[PDB]
Design a protein around this motif. Structure first.
Motif, PDB file in Angstrom:
ATOM      1  N   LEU C  46       0.837  -1.197   0.000  1.00 54.05           N
ATOM      2  CA  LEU C  46       0.000   0.000   0.000  1.00 54.05           C
ATOM      3  C   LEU C  46       0.872   1.247   0.000  1.00 54.05           C
ATOM      4  O   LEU C  46       0.378   2.370   0.089  1.00 54.05           O
ATOM      5  N   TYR C  47       2.178   1.031  -0.109  1.00 52.30           N
ATOM      6  CA  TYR C  47       3.134   2.122  -0.216  1.00 52.30           C
ATOM      7  C   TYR C  47       3.850   2.027  -1.557  1.00 52.30           C
ATOM      8  O   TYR C  47       4.367   0.972  -1.922  1.00 52.30           O
ATOM      9  N   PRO C  51      11.236   2.777   2.409  1.00 48.07           N
ATOM     10  CA  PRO C  51      12.586   2.702   2.966  1.00 48.07           C
ATOM     11  C   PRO C  51      12.959   1.266   3.312  1.00 48.07           C
ATOM     12  O   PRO C  51      12.130   0.514   3.825  1.00 48.07           O
ATOM     13  N   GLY C  57      13.783  -3.552   9.901  1.00 52.51           N
ATOM     14  CA  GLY C  57      13.380  -3.555  11.294  1.00 52.51           C
ATOM     15  C   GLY C  57      12.231  -4.511  11.544  1.00 52.51           C
ATOM     16  O   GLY C  57      12.199  -5.211  12.556  1.00 52.51           O
TER      17      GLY C  57
END
Lengths: 363, 384, 119, 175
Positions: C46-47, C51, C57
């Protein structure tokens, strides 16, 4: 015969008292760097005891708080009040205590406001300034008008225990103070509600009076003090802060409300600043509809508020009210007018809750 | 800050001397105030080991009379108590024996032998007439001696023995005392999120014995502010800002009050400057010293997160210039923070540009809508 | 997983309940491995562009450290979640129909209303 | 209630009241500059020339002892009316005009006071605007949506005109 006066006048009374008196004397007290403070605290410490009656003890306490709140820092007085522990006792009775209970509340409400703590002052004064009869609750009323009432005299003499004018503090000052507070507090929250974001609900003193004026057939240029405060409010709504600051003096000048304080200049500038802040807030709240983007430099110059304050207030508020607003610190610019998808999600949740409730009844 | 007032402020003897010795050891060996006052204070008491240390260099000059008198009076007192306890074990009365155990505890404590003070302190267990006074006071003592021997485990233990004990009185602060001890144990043991919950909880309005009134204000305040993971908006708002009782402690140390007001109000630069200012004093705090670097860093991370979530795209160089703190330092701090995964900051130092992200998008909203619809359907079924 | 794994470990007895028939706990382990995958898909892209560090992470939590270089690409193969620009030199992932969806929602709303009226 | 109280049959409009002003007796004793002003603002108002006309007309009033006295006390509301008209007309002329240009086009006491006026005109619904402070531009209406509904509103007007025209043609038919 001492507390309600200034350290000077008191020391004059004391000095003059000692000049008359013979040089030889017996005194429990020992002289201190401050002659006066030690006198008050001395008799204070004397009066309070487990054995000692509440009316006398509480009397002492209240006198301490009054004097200290006038001639000493506010925090000390607050500490005394909360440590002294009189809730039931203060109300009844001590005969003259009622004045002390409400008089000292008024006084710390005043000194805290002199310190330019608005949030504190509005906390302090609300209970006692909700009173329609407050003038009487402060024990200040013309003896004559109630002397016709109270008669017969036998009953009447006890009834008319109201405090002397020199002790008494003007009501206009108090009322204007509290209303100025309630203005600063309730205006931005009103405006936002006008915005309709409705993150939080806040009540501002003198709000009812403002509503009455709006529904008035006639709107005159401000004459009574509440009207000057009023005009300052509407001026805040439209985003003229200069007008608002002007009006308070205009209402004040007839009132003489701000002239009754020794520090008046300091409080004028302090209030000028706090009003700058809250008016900036109010502006932003009302006008975010038609503005998609903003300039922190221009806003800073025009509200006469340095950017460090501006960015802080705006970011804080936006984060607190969950406003769909975005700030770029790098270019110093703001964004609004958005989310749809999220809103719908919320509505769904609410609906679910309602359904659950209905189920309860069904059961 | 002046030492006279600080040393004066804390009731506890360990705080009175151990703090002076900490300030002395902690910052500068040379400075007079830590050593002069500690010397003079020790010379008021029965511990020659501390006195012997004072005698040693960086300490007030050794005196033969002070040590011999203390030492001899001790020999005498120890013989006395030994006998008295012999006799009390042999009138068959619990109270006397308890006093003897307590009195051996006092004697050992003042004499500075802590292990023994503890042992003989808790030896009063069996002979406790009642758990609440005989036993809870035993707790308060094990708590004092355990704090001073630096085992905060044991402190929590006797805190749970005390507050677990069946008889509890609302009026008595001892609640207050125990809150303070627990808070202190948590603080000594990411953010704990316990320490602050404890310290914030209540004020006795009576002397802490364990915690400086300022100490509770500052410990509560900083621990809370640094609890991003645990803290609710209420935890910042509910348990600190809105908490009227804690306001009492807070008004004691106004720099901390304004520090918190600054943070809550979104001026993180001001907040962090206060912190930078106080840092040197807080490194003098005997309990706080070890956590200072951690708490401040956590607060900075929280501030970055507040800045970082609210802006999709950030001009990093401008932020560093406009930070009120050096841009390079800020970048370094961000770099340190990121690996921990504390921040989802998408940063190149060289670019000076930072970017954080929290048909696809359109589908997202659509999905949510569908979710709500499902819930509604479920409710309908339940009704049927 | 750490909690999930422990749940299997403690309630090892329930799984066992014949022993030859279920010598190795096979089914439960298979089920758990499917269960672990679902949460990552749940972010579900959805992006447009993401990054690498944020992905690292999140993938770090998964037991294999190297999985994200591998674990992320593997997810793409599964097709539960879509990754764009993966294996790129940059190293940063990129991430009528609508009307139909809206109409569908409207239908559900009407259905709910019908049941309410009928009730 | 007060309008009925003054023997007025009903509350009037400013245009209505003006007509009495329009009448010669008010006009005959009326200073000429005001008649000109009325032309400039009420009759033939053009933003591209209003500033100049006002600049040449405002000098005359100041010089007069009596005219200036009448004028001094109406400067504010007059200014408000003129600027309101300028904002409306600009709303008709533009779709997205630069903040520099819009403020520049109409005279203001201060650049910020001009923005204030523009928003006030918007709140009272004399104009709809969206002010983008980032780009320093103002739009008299997501982007494509605002263009779509502007197009629709144009098409509608066009249709109306055509319809009216057809009616006129009918008359020509008889000719």
């Amino acid at each position: 015969h001492t507390y309600y006066k200034f350290d000077y006048k008191a020391h004059q009374r004391q000095l003059t008292p000692p000049e008359g008196s013979s040089k030889s004397e017996q005194d429990q007290a020992e002289n201190e760097g401050e002659d006066s403070a030690v006198l008050m605290e001395r008799l204070c410490k004397y009066i309070y005891a487990k054995d000692r009656t509440d009316r006398i003890r509480t009397c002492a306490i209240l006198c301490h708080i009054y004097h200290h709140a006038l001639h000493s820092r506010w925090y000390q007085a607050r500490d005394l009040m909360l440590m002294s522990h009189l809730q039931d006792n203060i109300q009844h009775a001590d005969p003259p205590v009622q004045i002390l209970y409400n008089r000292t509340m008024v006084q710390l409400g005043i000194c805290a406001f002199r310190q330019g703590l608005t949030k504190d002052a509005h906390n302090a004064l609300l209970d006692i300034q909700s009173s329609g009869r407050a003038k009487e609750l402060l024990g200040q009323g013309l003896l004559l008008r109630s002397l016709q009432e109270r008669n017969q005299e036998q009953e009447k003499v006890e009834r008319r225990r109201q405090v002397p004018f020199h002790l008494h503090i003007n009501l206009e000052l108090l009322e204007c103070v509290y209303l100025v507070s309630a203005m600063l507090l309730e205006i931005p929250y009103m405006a936002a509600h006008e915005s309709d974001a409705r993150r939080r609900m806040i009540s501002k003193q003198f709000h009812h009076q403002l509503r009455v004026g709006e529904r008035q057939p006639l709107l005159g240029p401000p004459e009574s003090m509440r009207e000057h405060v009023v005009a300052a409010s509407k001026a805040m709504k439209m985003g003229d802060w200069k007008t608002c600051h002007s009006f308070i003096i205009n209402e004040k000048m007839n009132g003489k409300v701000w002239d009754l304080f020794p520090e008046a200049d300091k409080v004028r500038t302090m209030l000028v600043r706090k009003i700058q802040e809250e008016s900036l807030r109010t502006y932003l709240f009302t006008y975010s509809s038609v503005y998609d983007s903003i300039s922190m430099e221009t806003l800073s110059d025009m509200f006469e508020l340095d950017l460090p304050t501006v960015h802080s207030i705006i970011s804080k508020m936006i984060i607190n009210e969950e406003l769909m607003a975005s700030l770029d610190q790098p270019t110093q610019t703001v964004v609004m007018h958005r989310x749809x998808x999220x809103x719908x999600x919320x509505x769904x949740x609410x609906x679910x809750x309602x359904x659950x409730x209905x189920x309860x009844x069904x059961x | 800050y002046d030492l006279t007032t600080r040393i004066a402020h804390f009731l506890d003897r360990h705080l009175v001397f151990p703090l002076l010795e900490f300030l002395s050891v902690k910052e500068i060996y040379n400075e007079k105030e830590l050593l002069q006052g500690k010397l003079d204070l020790l010379s008021d008491t029965n511990m020659v080991d501390f006195a012997m240390d004072v005698y040693k260099n960086l300490y007030s000059d050794d005196i033969p009379h002070a040590l011999r008198e203390k030492r001899t009076t001790v020999v005498a007192q120890l013989k006395q108590l030994q006998a008295e306890t012999e006799p009390i074990v042999k009138h068959g009365f619990r109270q006397e024996y308890l006093d003897t155990l307590y009195r051996y505890a006092k004697f050992q404590y003042e004499c500075g032998n802590y292990s023994g003070a503890a042992e003989y302190l808790y030896f009063f267990r069996v002979l406790v007439p009642a758990t609440d006074r005989n036993a809870l006071s035993s707790l308060w003592g094990k708590l004092a001696s355990e704090i001073l021997m630096q085992n905060w485990d044991a402190a929590m233990e006797d805190l749970t023995r005390l507050k677990e004990t069946i008889d509890n009185n609302s009026v008595s602060s001892p609640l207050q005392s125990l809150q303070q001890r627990t808070w202190l144990i948590h603080w000594s043991l990411k953010g704990r999120d316990n320490i602050i919950d404890l310290f914030l909880y209540q004020p006795q309005y009576l002397n802490a014995i364990q915690t400086m009134c300022p100490h509770i204000l500052r410990y509560l305040t900083t621990a809370v502010i640094t609890n991003k993971d645990v803290r609710k908006r209420r935890q910042v708002l509910k348990d600190l800002v809105k908490v009227i009782q804690q306001e009492s402690y807070t008004y004691k140390d106004p720099i901390t009050e304004f520090v918190e007001c600054l943070y809550v109000n979104f001026d993180f630069d001001g907040a962090q400057k206060k912190l930078r200012e106080c840092e040197s004093v807080l490194v003098n705090d005997f309990f706080l010293v070890a956590c200072l670097e951690d708490f401040i860093e956590n607060a900075r991370l929280f501030i970055f997160e507040t800045f970082c979530r609210i802006h999709q795209c950030i001009s990093i160089n401008m932020l560093a210039d406009k930070l009120n703190m050096t841009p390079e330092e800020a970048e370094r701090w961000i770099v340190n923070l990121i690996r921990n995964a504390r921040l989802d900051a998408k940063i190149d130092s060289k670019l000076g540009h930072v970017v954080m992200g929290n048909x696809x998008x359109x589908x997202x909203x659509x999905x949510x809508x569908x979710x709500x619809x499902x819930x509604x359907x479920x409710x309908x079924x339940x009704x049927x | 997983p750490q909690v999930y794994e422990e749940l299997f470990s403690y309630s090892c007895p329930k799984f066992l309940s014949e022993p030859f028939l279920q010598q190795l706990k096979v089914f439960s382990d298979e089920v758990q491995q499917q269960a672990q995958l679902s949460t990552i898909r749940s972010f579900l892209k959805l992006y447009t562009t993401m990054p690498v560090a944020k992905l690292a992470g999140f993938l770090d939590l998964t037991e294999q450290e190297f999985r994200i270089q591998l674990l992320v690409f593997k997810h793409k193969m599964k097709n539960l979640v879509w990754t764009s620009g993966i294996s790129a030199l940059d190293g940063e992932f990129q991430s009528x129909x609508x009307x139909x969806x809206x109409x569908x929602x409207x239908x559900x709303x009407x259905x709910x209303x019908x049941x309410x009226x009928x009730x | 209630r007060l309008a009925t109280l003054l023997g007025l049959q009903a509350p009037p409009t400013r245009i209505g009241l003006i007509n009495d002003m329009v009448r010669f007796n008010v006009l005959q004793y009326v200073v000429p500059e005001v008649k000109d002003l009325y032309n400039w603002l009420e009759v033939e108002f053009n933003p591209l020339k209003l500033c100049e006309r006002v600049t040449k007309v405002l000098n005359w009033v100041r010089e007069q002892p009596e005219k200036e006295p009448e004028l001094q006390q109406y400067v504010p509301q007059l200014q408000n009316n003129t600027i309101l008209r300028l904002l409306q007309q600009v709303s008709q002329i533009y779709q997205s005009i630069e903040f520099s240009r819009l403020t520049s086009l109409v005279p203001f006491v201060d650049a910020f006071q001009l923005e204030r006026a523009i928003v006030d005109a918007a709140r009272h619904c004399d104009l709809q605007v969206r002010i983008d402070h980032t780009s320093r531009t103002l739009s008299f209406g997501x982007x494509x949506x605002x263009x779509x509904x502007x197009x629709x509103x144009x098409x509608x007007x066009x249709x109306x005109x055509x319809x009216x025209x057809x009616x006129x043609x009918x008359x020509x038919x008889x000719x």
